[PDB]
Curated annotation (Swiss-Prot), chain A:
SUPFAM superfamilies: Translation proteins. One of its GO terms (molecular function) is RNA binding. The modification Phosphoserine is found at S12, S303. The modification N6-acetyllysine is found at K135, K285, K293, K365, K372. InterPro entries: L3_arc_euk, Ribosomal_L3_dom_3_arc_sf, Ribosomal_uL3, Ribosomal_uL3_CS, Transl_B-barrel_sf. The keyword Ribonucleoprotein applies. This is Large ribosomal subunit protein uL3. Residues 1-36 are annotated as: Disordered.
Curated annotation (Swiss-Prot), chain E:
The chain holds residues 2 to 58 of 117 of the full protein. The modification N6-acetyllysine is found at K35, K42. The gene is RPL34. The modification Phosphoserine is found at S11. Transmembrane segments: none annotated. Component of the large ribosomal subunit. Component of the large ribosomal subunit. The ribosome is a large ribonucleoprotein complex responsible for the synthesis of proteins in the cell. Belongs to the eukaryotic ribosomal protein eL34 family. This is Large ribosomal subunit protein eL34. It comes from the Eukaryota. It is found in: Cytoplasm, Cytosol; Cytoplasm; Endoplasmic reticulum.
Amino acid sequence: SHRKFSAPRHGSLGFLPRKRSSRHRGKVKSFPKDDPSKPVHLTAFLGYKAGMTHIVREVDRPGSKVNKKEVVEAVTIVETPPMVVVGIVGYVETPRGLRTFKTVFAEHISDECKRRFYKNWHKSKKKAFTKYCKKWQDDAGKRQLDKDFSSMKKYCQVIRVLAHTQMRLLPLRQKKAHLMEIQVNGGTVAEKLDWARERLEQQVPVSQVFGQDEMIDVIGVTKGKGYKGVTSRWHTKKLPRKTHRGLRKVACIGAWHPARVAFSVARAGQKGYHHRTEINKKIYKIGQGYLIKDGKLIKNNASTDYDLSDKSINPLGGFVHYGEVTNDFVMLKGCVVGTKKRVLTLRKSLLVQTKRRALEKIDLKFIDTTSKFGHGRFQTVEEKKAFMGPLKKD
Amino acid sequence: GMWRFYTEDSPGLKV
Amino acid sequence: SMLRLQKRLASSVLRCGKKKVWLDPNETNEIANANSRQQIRKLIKDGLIIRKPVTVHSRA
Amino acid sequence: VRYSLDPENPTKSCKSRGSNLRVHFKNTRETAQAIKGMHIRKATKYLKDVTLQKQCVPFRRYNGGVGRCAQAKQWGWTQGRWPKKSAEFLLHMLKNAESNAELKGLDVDSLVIEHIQVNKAPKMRRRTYRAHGRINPYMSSPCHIEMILTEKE
Amino acid sequence: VQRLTYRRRLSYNTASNKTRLSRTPGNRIVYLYTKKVGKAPKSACGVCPGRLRGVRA
RNA sequence: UGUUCACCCACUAAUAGGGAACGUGAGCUGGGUUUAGACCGUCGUGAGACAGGUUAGUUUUACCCUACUGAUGAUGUGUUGU
RNA sequence: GAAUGGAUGAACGAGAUUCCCACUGUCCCUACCUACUAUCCAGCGAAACCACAGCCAAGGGAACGGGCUUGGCGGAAUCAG
RNA sequence: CCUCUGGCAUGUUGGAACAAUGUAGGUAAGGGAAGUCGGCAAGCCGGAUCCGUAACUUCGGGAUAAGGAUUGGCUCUAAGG
RNA sequence: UGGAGCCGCCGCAGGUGCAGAUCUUGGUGGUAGUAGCAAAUAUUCAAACGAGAACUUUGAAGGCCGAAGUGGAGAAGGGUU
Ligand SMILES: [Mg+2]
Ligand SMILES: [Mg+2]
Ligand SMILES: [Mg+2]
Ligand SMILES: [Mg+2]
Ligand SMILES: [Mg+2]
Ligand SMILES: [Mg+2]
Ligand SMILES: [Mg+2]
Ligand SMILES: [Mg+2]
Ligand SMILES: [Mg+2]
Ligand SMILES: [Mg+2]
Ligand SMILES: [Mg+2]
Ligand SMILES: [Mg+2]
Ligand SMILES: [Mg+2]
Ligand SMILES: [Mg+2]
Ligand SMILES: [Mg+2]
Ligand SMILES: [Mg+2]
Ligand SMILES: [Mg+2]
Ligand SMILES: [Mg+2]
Ligand SMILES: [Mg+2]
Ligand SMILES: [Mg+2]
Ligand SMILES: [Mg+2]
Ligand SMILES: [Mg+2]
Ligand SMILES: [Mg+2]
Ligand SMILES: [Mg+2]
Ligand SMILES: [Mg+2]
Ligand SMILES: [Mg+2]
Ligand SMILES: [Mg+2]
Ligand SMILES: [Mg+2]
Ligand SMILES: [Mg+2]
Ligand SMILES: [Mg+2]
Ligand SMILES: [Mg+2]
């Protein structure tokens, strides 16, 4: 018979085999469409979720009940130190698909990077690319290198650049820079490929790729939650108190007769650590990192035109389970998938963004710097110190 | 031999 | 080596628990040739086996 | 006695067995296959590692419910265990053999374990008490073992 | 505190098995079994409720 | 109301109808039917009867195969990694 | 419907109801924590059950098939569920 | 509940982890039975002192009805042989 | 292989041929190295003996039973414990 009292189904099938991701680093599953007209540029970048905080701002959507009212608003910080382009890589279109074609690498590649070509650097003799970089210092090779490029200049349709992170600069424990292919969408294939050839062994910082007040798409792997029961996994109803074998279950699996159980029925398995592609995370700010001229310029980070203090985004006592974000960073509105220290793939949108909300320009009045390791009440040490006075440890 | 049921249980009762 | 005999006998000779019995763990061999009592009585006078004190339980 | 399988050159091969030993046949079997073919000075090292859990034994046949371990990767199998009794039992059987080679006058440290066979021995028996006054059997499943080493260097 | 045991196999409290404490020379409270309390003879006259005098009860 | 059914309140965009061993008891519950105790009424000379009312009344087993969910792996690609 | 007892009735009741107050995770609507388990390992080590076995759709068929027909299709060895 | 006399080695094993399901305990914002057949389960209540106690009643009860108040620590006073 | 008896023909005789009987007795698999060895808070350090110690004994520490006892004694029952 039918179901007496309807309800929607729990979960969405369009996300499943609810399995532990194969990857750790979030793949850009689809870059946006190149055109011609608009200059070459990368389409994406690679970051590290440090943590979160408030922001205060005036808000200018006329019509609202919040119009030119300040609000507080959540943000993530994503520690995003400049990438290095090491290789390029051409893709040819085919009726099968999009076959990879011709991969050049640079002369020099950092150890940061070369780590990733070994499971075990301690043990390894560190011999990768030794016999390759020979090419870059003779005639014969250097000619073949040009032919390898000029082939791509004729044939290949799509050219992405390979880059890697500068793992060095992050507080994180690992030394193995994540590599990545990042797509160059811009002018003709030659022009494209020439731009990449100029960028080889070279830095590419965040600002070059993304701009402020820009909707981007975060991709990254979810915070992982082990095996779980159907209840926390699928958010099916808990059964009632009296229930002789378990109540954090799904009473009936299937009906009798299609007498298998279906993929559509809620079972217990891996919760979290899925691969996920969020979209539309605005960029409330892109901070310049630390640097010097005579003394430090730490001020420039969490400072605003309405605060003008000397704060870093680094809250008191560091970002928790992370460290000091010394480098440049992007400050997305809201949460992003995945956990502290996670390698987080930012990407330009696939989408023509033309909505009131998605074009609003941001002007922050205040970035909250208060400790995250307890109910913090002081923005910065200087302030705390004055408030309390001197102590017994003096 | 294994218990299965009480003699007033008479499992599959369908009076 | 194995002494439960000698902890019993001690106890009944002191007329105490066996909790209260204490055997000098160094001088064990000498104790393990106390297959009788009276043998033990010797060992009590020589100070190998000894009656412990009562575990205090003050009223203060 | 008659061993199963005579060695090709008895002259320079040594023997050792032990009938009706109270070790898990199934654990013993498998580790005895693991051991097979090694140089004796390797196998004594292996079985030491097993006893300490520094190398597993792949459970291949009798592998049901038997968990996974990385250490089994070496072998190229997902199941694996550390059957400490078994090891200790055929660490003796290697010792007796090594001895038998030494008495026959073979270069001990050229031996290779050419044939090693576990076998079901006649079961001991005792019982267990169950619910509703039933009584079930509780059987030890011991194993005859035997093996033949050989000079090969 | 020194508790104690029945000196005889009669485990039950009963009219038989009645006791008292004695300390001893050896200094241990031991149980002694008592005798039953016998009564002085009653009058033959019947009417009188008193038991007789000068008669070891 | 044990109910299916029905009815009524309230909100709603709408409060459409149906199937899957009258989906679904090693998923539950067990309120109802449907043992045994007992109560009433009617029937029966009586033992007893009653799709007439009432109250009390043990809901067993998965460690197999499969199916499903997750999890190791497998064949190839010389070996390995990207 | 009148000792096949009729009508009552304080007190009592692990008795059958109904309602109100308080109370609460019964519920919205689920979460966290503890201990024993399950899990993995060393040692030990049963049982029920078992024609053969073990992916489906439809068909026909003792009128609801794992086996038959016709299609879909099929990839060792396993783990927790 | 904690202890002394006396007795024991955690009840037929150990180790490592701390996932799901369980078994046994807890806690829960706001709401407060909407849950369910049904408040099942748990929760409230609770000890003593001082007040203060209804209908009804076989005048015995109902009654700890109901309903309120107080309680620690310390330093004194007074009263009782 | 084994180590002491056996057969062809003609007649006579029968307790004369097994896949099943939820058949009888015995033995053996799969299940499975699985289910399990989770009621009552608790173990640790050293030393001895010893081929060998998570468990034996000795000492120390931490714990429990907490005099309606996990203490000391008997009845019935056991029958050398
Ligand atoms: Mg419907
Ligand atoms: Mg139940
Ligand atoms: Mg925090
Ligand atoms: Mg299991
Ligand atoms: Mg049992
Ligand atoms: Mg019995
Ligand atoms: Mg007498
Ligand atoms: Mg006289
Ligand atoms: Mg039905
Ligand atoms: Mg079912
Ligand atoms: Mg059932
Ligand atoms: Mg019922
Ligand atoms: Mg009945
Ligand atoms: Mg009548
Ligand atoms: Mg009548
Ligand atoms: Mg069938
Ligand atoms: Mg315990
Ligand atoms: Mg123990
Ligand atoms: Mg016991
Ligand atoms: Mg609440
Ligand atoms: Mg209701
Ligand atoms: Mg309802
Ligand atoms: Mg209750
Ligand atoms: Mg009342
Ligand atoms: Mg003979
Ligand atoms: Mg005959
Ligand atoms: Mg037969
Ligand atoms: Mg197991
Ligand atoms: Mg207690
Ligand atoms: Mg005694
Ligand atoms: Mg006793």
